[PDB]
Design a protein around this nucleic acid. Structure first.
Lengths: 49, 181, 77, 48, 124
RNA sequence: GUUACGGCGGUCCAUAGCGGCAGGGAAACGCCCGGUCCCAUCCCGAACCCGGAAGCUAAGCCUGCCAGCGCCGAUGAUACUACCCAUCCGGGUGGAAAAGUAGGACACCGCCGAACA
RNA sequence: GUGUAAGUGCACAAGGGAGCUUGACUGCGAGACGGACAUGUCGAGCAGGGACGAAAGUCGGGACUAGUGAUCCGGCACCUCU
């Protein structure tokens, strides 16, 4: 639709998932953002699932 | 190594103006500050390419890269929207300004078709001159074969003058081809 | 008729007045804009809420034309 | 001066119909510039 | 009667305004005073200010003939001046300070003197 | 300690501002000269930065004097009002404006530093 | 002028521009506001690991106040549970 709910699984496995929204036509490609992952305890990149 | 116009202003024009107006202190001698050339395309609101043509014309004539001016107000009669390119602008200072002034005065102005003179009434209070051309063919920095559509300018020569009379005197001493009124 | 719609009252305003002694973190005013500006030992929240950063007494003052709220460190016994 | 943002500069000699050699800077790459008319020959400047 | 403002007017007003906009976040105390630097074209000056009391615990400048004698450049003069403000703060009992750049950018002479003060024992 | 001085701060931030007239460059503050170096322009060494001091107080700055514009501003009285009388009308005790006027005002205070003792 | 109603603010800018970036964090949270209850709201500060900055420091989305739906039931990912 636009700004739907999207999930960022921790690239470093861990199944750490952040959620947020984005405009799926402003950014049709998958979102990539570097975020803190609790179990690893480090700032690893996160990829849209 | 000095521009000949700057040499002339430093040596003879300064003394001439000092005699003419009897300034109480040496730092009242009205000298030029900068030269601004404006090429308002206007029609670029339809097609972007005209702004690039204006960019090339200004870069070739003045000699330095021009700055694109954004439309700061939206209007519908000219179907203008905020943010699209409208005109280019170059600020000339120092040696580049002096050499551009020399080139224009000694070459470009006499190349104007049926050039009869520039009215000395165009000053505004503080002796800043602002005239405007219609085409760009007068400069040989550009080429008639290269050009495809005329593009006039608005040359503004802001000086240190305080009055219209002092500014007109300084510009006339500089070699400006004024009319007589 | 079109009318008949209104929002709930937000209970804004000044919570502690001049001279009242407060603990750190206590809310001083609930405002929309910055009608009062933070002074000494006074912070500003996300909704522009003023609160105390240290214990003491509320003092209302003006700083350069703006009404401000400050906390005075009352004397220990 | 941002380096790659401006065109080339060169001392160019401006030639008028009067015969004056004018060593001055420009961007024309011919070295010597030849022009038919200038301030030294134009009727308005010369009062004709 | 010149038509508009002088360039000195514009420079002075702009510098005062942008010193004020940074004084929003930078204020000096007794143990943590504000090191505010005033830089001119011919000189540089620094003071140690406790903003609550409006006093000055220490000061240094290139006006002093002792620091006038160094033949080094303006940067060398600023380096020396930073050294003097450093050990005068040392003699003043002040250890940690907050650097106020006085509405000038942090570069050139001001950066050189701030680094000189930092190396000379002033932690900021 | 003093100077027509430079800074850093104040004050329920104009009683301070703006404007007009008359002055100055000791050190400082500037304007100023130039772009070789750090750095900079959505183009421009204009600005920022850097390197200097040939020139100048014309400006900034500050000094003195002007109520001119702004600004501050009583007392009294009145409007209004709490309580109480009063069958309405109105009255008594207390609080007390805004506006206006008299007037004030061409700032005051603190800490350093220059030049002089 | 502030994305968007109106209001309270903001020129010290919260208004305009540029560079880097993902704090539109994880564990929490003294103290409070508002409240029949359920909701709701603000919050200094501490630890981890970061961004920007010379530094001081600021950052737990957006000038603020709307952009929302309890419980039940079910789906998906992970867990040193059963």
């Amino acid at each position: 639709d636009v700004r739907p709910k999207i999930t960022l699984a921790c690239e470093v496995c861990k199944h750490r998932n952040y959620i947020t929204k984005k405009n799926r036509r402003n950014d049709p490609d998958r979102l990539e953002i570097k975020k803190f992952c609790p179990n690893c305890g480090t700032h690893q990149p996160h990829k849209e699932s | 190594a000095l521009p000949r116009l700057k040499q002339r202003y430093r040596e003879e024009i300064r003394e001439a103006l000092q005699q003419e107006f009897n300034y109480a202190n040496v730092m009242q001698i009205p000298g030029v500050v900068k030269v601004v050339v404006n090429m308002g395309v206007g029609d670029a609101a339809r097609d972007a390419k005209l702004i690039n043509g204006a960019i090339n014309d200004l870069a070739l004539i003045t000699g330095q890269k021009p700055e694109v001016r954004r439309a700061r107000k939206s209007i519908a009669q000219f179907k203008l929207r905020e943010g699209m390119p409208i005109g280019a602008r170059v600020t000339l200072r120092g040696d580049r300004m002096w050499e551009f002034l020399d080139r224009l005065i000694s070459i470009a102005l006499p190349r104007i078709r049926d050039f009869r003179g520039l009215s000395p009434k165009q000053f505004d209070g503080t002796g800043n001159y602002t005239f405007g051309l219609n085409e760009q063919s007068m400069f040989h920095e550009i080429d008639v074969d290269s050009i495809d559509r005329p593009r006039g300018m608005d040359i503004t020569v802001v000086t240190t003058a305080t009055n219209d009379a002092e500014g007109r005197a300084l510009l006339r001493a500089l070699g400006f081809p004024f009319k007589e009124n | 008729s079109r009318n008949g719609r209104d929002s709930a009252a937000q209970r804004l305003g000044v919570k502690r007045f001049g001279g009242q002694v407060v603990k750190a973190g206590e809310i001083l005013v609930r405002q929309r804009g910055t009608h009062f500006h933070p002074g000494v030992n006074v912070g500003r929240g996300g909704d522009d809420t003023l609160f105390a950063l240290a214990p003491g007494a509320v003092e209302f003052g003006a700083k350069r034309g703006r009404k401000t709220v400050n906390i005075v460190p009352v004397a220990r016994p | 001066m941002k380096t790659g943002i401006h065109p080339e500069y060169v001392d160019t000699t401006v030639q008028c119909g009067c015969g004056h050699s004018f060593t001055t800077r420009s961007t024309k790459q011919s070295g010597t510039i030849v022009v038919e008319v200038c301030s030294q020959c134009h009727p308005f400047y010369t009062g004709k | 009667k010149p038509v508009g403002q002088n360039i000195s007017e514009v420079r002075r007003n702009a510098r005062l305004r942008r010193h004020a906009r940074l004084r929003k976040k930078v204020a000096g105390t007794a143990e943590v005073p504000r090191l505010v630097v005033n830089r001119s074209a011919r000189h540089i000056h620094v003071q140690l200010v406790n903003d609550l009391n409006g006093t000055t615990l220490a000061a240094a400048s290139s006006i002093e003939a002792d620091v006038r004698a160094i033949d080094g450049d303006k940067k060398a003069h600023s380096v020396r001046v930073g050294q003097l403000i450093a050990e005068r703060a040392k003699a003043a009992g002040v250890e940690t300070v907050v650097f106020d750049r006085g509405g000038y950018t942090y570069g050139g002479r001001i950066a050189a003197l701030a680094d000189a003060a930092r190396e000379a024992g002033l932690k900021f």
